[PDB]
Amino acid sequence: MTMMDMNFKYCHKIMKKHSKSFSYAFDLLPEDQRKAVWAIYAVCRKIDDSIDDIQFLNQIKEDIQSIEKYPYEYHHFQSDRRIMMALQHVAQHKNIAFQSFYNLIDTVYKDQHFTMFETDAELFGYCYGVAGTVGEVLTPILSDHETHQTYDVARRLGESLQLINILRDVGEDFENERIYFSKQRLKQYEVDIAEVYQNGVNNHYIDLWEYYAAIAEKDFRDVMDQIKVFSIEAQPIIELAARIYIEILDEVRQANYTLHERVFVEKRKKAKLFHEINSKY
Ligand SMILES: [Mg+2]
C-alpha cells in the first residue's frame, strides 16, 4: 500500500477502536466513501480526546485552518500528521464544512469549564456541538447533492445518536463528574443522579430517562422518514448505523437502567439488524 493508504488505515483503526457500531456500519460503504468517513471520524475523535491543556487542540484547529485556506499546498501539520494528510486528501475531492469542525472544537474547549445544563435547550445545544457537527461534516460524503435538508437530517441524526450515547452513559459520566440531563428536568422529575448512583434506579429516574429516550426515538423516526436525502448506497448504511445505535436503548432497559456498566449491542445482533434492513433494500 501507499503512504496515503497507511494514513487512511490509521484513521480506520481509530474509528473502529472507538465505535464498533459505527465502524460496523460505515465500513460497508464503497471504498472511496468509507475512507473519507474514517478520516473525518478520526479527526473528530482526536478533537474530542485532545485535552487529555488546550495545546494539542489548538494545533488541530490550526491544522484544519491550513487545509481550509490552502487545500493543495503541502503542510507540516502540527497535530496528527497521518490524520490531517487523510483529511486534506478528502478535502481535495469533497466539500468539507469547515465551520462545523470549528463549532465542534469550540464545544470541546468549553467542556473544560463544564457546568450542568440549566435547561434542555442547553443540553440539545451541546448535542449539536459535539455530534450534530459530525453529522454536518459527513454530509457531503453520504449524499450526491447536498441541500439544507440533507444537512438538517444528518444534523438531527447525529444529535439523536449523542442523546442515545448520554442515555447509555449516565453512570460512567457521573464517575467523571459530568451529568448531562438538565437541572430543569432533574428538578421536575425529582431525580438526583448521585443518589441514584448510590442507591439504584427508582421510578422517578426511570421516568426521566424514558422522557429523553422518547425524544431520541421520535427524532430517529423522523430521520428514517427522510433517509432518501442520502445517496442510494449510503441509505441502508445510515439506517443500519442508526438502528444499531438505537438498539442501545433497549439494551439499557434490559439491564434495568444500570448506572454501573456500559451496555452494548453484541456483534451478532448487529448482523441481525443488517439482515432486516438489507432485506428492505
Ligand atoms: Mg458517552
Curated annotation (Swiss-Prot):
Which Gene Ontology terms describe the biological processes this protein takes part in?
A: carotenoid biosynthetic process
Q: Does the keyword Metal-binding apply?
A: yes
Query: Which positions are annotated as binding Mg(2+) 1?
Result: 48, 52
Q: Which reaction does it catalyse?
A: 2 (2E,6E)-farnesyl diphosphate = 15-cis-4,4'-diapophytoene + 2 diphosphate
**Which residues does the record give as Mg(2+) 2 binding sites?**
165, 169
Gene3D superfamilies per UniProt: Farnesyl Diphosphate Synthase
Q: In which pathway does it act?
A: Carotenoid biosynthesis; staphyloxanthin biosynthesis; staphyloxanthin from farnesyl diphosphate: step 1/5
From the UniProt record, which GO molecular function terms apply? geranylgeranyl diphosphate synthase activity; metal ion binding; squalene synthase [NAD(P)H] activity
Q: Which cofactor does it need?
A: Mg(2+)
Carries keyword Metal-binding? Answer: yes
**Residues that coordinate or bind (2E,6E)-farnesyl diphosphate 1:** 18-21, 41, 45, 168, 245
Give the note describing cofactor binding and stoichiometry: Binds 2 Mg(2+) ions per subunit. A third Mg(2+) ion binds between the 2 farnesyl diphosphate (FPP).
- UniProt keywords, alphabetically: Carotenoid biosynthesis, Magnesium, Metal-binding, Transferase, Virulence
The lineage's top-level taxon is Bacteria
What EC number(s) does the entry state?
2.5.1.96
Q: Where does (2E,6E)-farnesyl diphosphate 2 bind?
A: 45, 162
Which EC main class describes this enzyme? Answer: transferase
User: What is the role of this chain?
Assistant: Involved in the biosynthesis of the yellow-orange carotenoid staphyloxanthin, which plays a role in the virulence via its protective function against oxidative stress. Catalyzes the head-to-head condensation of two molecules of farnesyl diphosphate (FPP) into the colorless C(30) carotenoid 4,4'-diapophytoene (dehydrosqualene).
What family name appears in the similarity comment? Belongs to the phytoene/squalene synthase family. CrtM subfamily.
What is this protein's name? 4,4'-diapophytoene synthase
**What taxonomic ancestry is recorded?**
Bacteria, Bacillati, Bacillota, Bacilli, Bacillales
